[PDB]
Enzyme design. Structure first.
Site, PDB file in Angstrom:
ATOM      1  CG  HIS A 149      -1.910  -0.096  -4.290  1.00 49.62           C
ATOM      2  ND1 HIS A 149      -2.638  -1.149  -4.736  1.00 49.62           N
ATOM      3  CD2 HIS A 149      -3.137   0.515  -3.456  1.00 49.62           C
ATOM      4  CE1 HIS A 149      -3.779  -1.264  -4.575  1.00 49.62           C
ATOM      5  NE2 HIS A 149      -4.130  -0.288  -3.768  1.00 49.62           N
ATOM      6  CG  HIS A 205      -2.075  -1.231   1.004  1.00 51.44           C
ATOM      7  ND1 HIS A 205      -2.084  -2.174   1.863  1.00 51.44           N
ATOM      8  CD2 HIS A 205      -3.104  -1.005   0.144  1.00 51.44           C
ATOM      9  CE1 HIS A 205      -3.119  -2.770   1.496  1.00 51.44           C
ATOM     10  NE2 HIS A 205      -3.740  -2.321   0.575  1.00 51.44           N
ATOM     11  CG  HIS A 207      -7.453   4.020  -3.508  1.00 50.29           C
ATOM     12  ND1 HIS A 207      -6.633   4.184  -4.263  1.00 50.29           N
ATOM     13  CD2 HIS A 207      -7.576   2.901  -3.145  1.00 50.29           C
ATOM     14  CE1 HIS A 207      -6.039   3.053  -4.393  1.00 50.29           C
ATOM     15  NE2 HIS A 207      -6.443   2.234  -3.501  1.00 50.29           N
ATOM     16  CG  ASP A 208      -5.245   2.360  -0.289  1.00 52.51           C
ATOM     17  OD1 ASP A 208      -6.000   2.100   0.505  1.00 52.51           O
ATOM     18  OD2 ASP A 208      -4.904   1.620  -1.209  1.00 52.51           O
ATOM     19  CG  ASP A 255      -8.180  -1.116  -3.828  1.00 54.17           C
ATOM     20  OD1 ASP A 255      -7.145  -0.891  -3.854  1.00 54.17           O
ATOM     21  OD2 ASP A 255      -8.840  -1.249  -2.669  1.00 54.17           O
TER      22      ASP A 255
END
Ligand SMILES: COc1ccc(C2=NN(C(C)C)C(=O)C2(C)C)cc1OCCCCOc1ccc(-c2nnn[nH]2)cc1
Ligand SMILES: [Mg+2]
Ligand SMILES: [Zn+2]
Length: 333
Positions: free
Chosen positions: A88, A84, A124-125, A237
């Site tokens: 990624h 992550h 988003h992470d 994802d």
């Protein structure tokens, strides 16, 4: 957030990416990283290039300079963990580009929605530490406690949205600054809704809701658009098993190491470790991948392709090809 220096932008602007077609389904980010000694800058140029080639930022009053600022502000907030990390989310960005433009999912969405997805891929992470929601909750960690007290299980996804909002509140990195009214509101709401939907505890229900909306000709149109965005971010994802086998494998190695580190930190804190997270049991990569394919990825991708995303057929074919290639690793072990 401390602004982006003239130096940092040029550092990215010089990467030329010889040999690479970033819009291609067989693009290999692992090979792109290894092709220089400044992988982070290469990753940022892939992001940047993908966003410009789409034609979208220019249409929505986002200059080249603001775009690149945003990309670099996202980068600064990704940590040095195995899976992550910034690689990624550039991957997810690149993959969603391919679902939109080679899988023709763009036909289902407005231009604004396509732009929001590509952007949302990169936020988003934000600030993932390599630990899942479960770790924070069952260790009664401060974020765990805060989430439990506020009636919210999506510990991390809420944290990702918070950081996304910080980056966007600075006009020098606000890729949505050229929007107004309901368009700006929609960008924020849809970005946030998509990021919240990446919580894997919500997997089944988000999938069922998407399929139910798609099966229904009288579905509310705004809701279908929204669910499609959510499903695409989720698809990006869990997209590692839709890639060429070697790419897919390298992703599975990075994830496995991350899960193992969490399992080591769980051990040290004297809380439950799950088999999968347990470094000692050393459960083979291959059976892992086949299991993931059978119980999560194949049904997900088959069902959304059947339901309405016909141009994403290749994902289902590549999952079958990859499953069969994992069986040949088993059959000849
Ligand atoms: C590259 O391979 C993987 C990529 C992502 C993941 C993930 N799975 N999960 C869990 C919570 C489902 C995640 O949060 C992410 C998105 C990180 C897993 C990958 O493969 C690693 C292989 C380990 C075994 O994986 C599974 C996972 C779930 C099942 C299952 N069985 N029944 N229902 N689910 C089986 C194997
Ligand atoms: Mg996440
Ligand atoms: Zn992710």
């Amino acid at each position: 957030v401390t602004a982006i220096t003239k130096v940092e932008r040029e550092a990215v602007l010089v990467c030329e990416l010889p040999s690479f077609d970033v819009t291609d389904v067989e693009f290999d980010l692992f090979r792109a990283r290894e092709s220089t000694d400044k992988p982070l800058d290469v990753a940022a140029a892939i992001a940047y290039r993908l966003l410009l080639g789409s034609g979208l930022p220019q249409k929505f009053g986002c200059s080249d300079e603001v775009l690149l600022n945003f990309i670099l502000q996202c980068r600064k907030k990704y940590r040095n963990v195995p899976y992550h990390n910034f690689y990624h989310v550039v991957d997810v960005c690149q993959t969603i580009h391919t679902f939109l433009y080679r899988g023709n999912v763009y036909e289902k969405l407005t231009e604004l929605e396509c732009f929001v997805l590509l952007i949302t891929a990169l936020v988003h992470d934000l600030d993932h530490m390599g630990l899942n929601n479960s770790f924070y909750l069952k260790t009664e960690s401060p974020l765990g406690i805060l989430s439990s007290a506020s009636g919210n299980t999506s510990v991390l996804e809420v944290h990702h949205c918070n950081l996304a909002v910080e980056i966007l509140s600075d006009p020098e990195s606000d890729v949505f600054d050229g929007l107004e009214g309901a368009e700006r509101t929609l960008a924020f709401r849809s970005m946030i809704d998509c990021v919240l939907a990446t919580d894997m505890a919500k997997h089944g229900s988000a999938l069922e809701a998407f399929l139910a909306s798609a099966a229904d000709q009288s579905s509310d149109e705004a809701a279908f658009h929204r669910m499609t965005m959510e499903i695409i971010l989720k698809a990006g994802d869990i997209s590692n098993v839709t890639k060429p086998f070697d790419i897919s494998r390298q992703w599975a190695m990075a994830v496995t190491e991350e899960f193992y580190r969490q399992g080591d930190m769980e051990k040290e804190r004297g809380v439950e470790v799950l088999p999968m997270f347990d470094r000692s049991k050393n459960m083979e990569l291959a059976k892992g991948q086949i299991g993931f394919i059978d119980f999560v990825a194949a049904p997900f991708f088959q069902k959304i392709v059947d339901a309405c995303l016909q141009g994403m057929q290749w994902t289902v074919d590549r999952i079958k090809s990859n499953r069969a290639q994992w069986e040949r690793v088993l059959e000849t072990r």
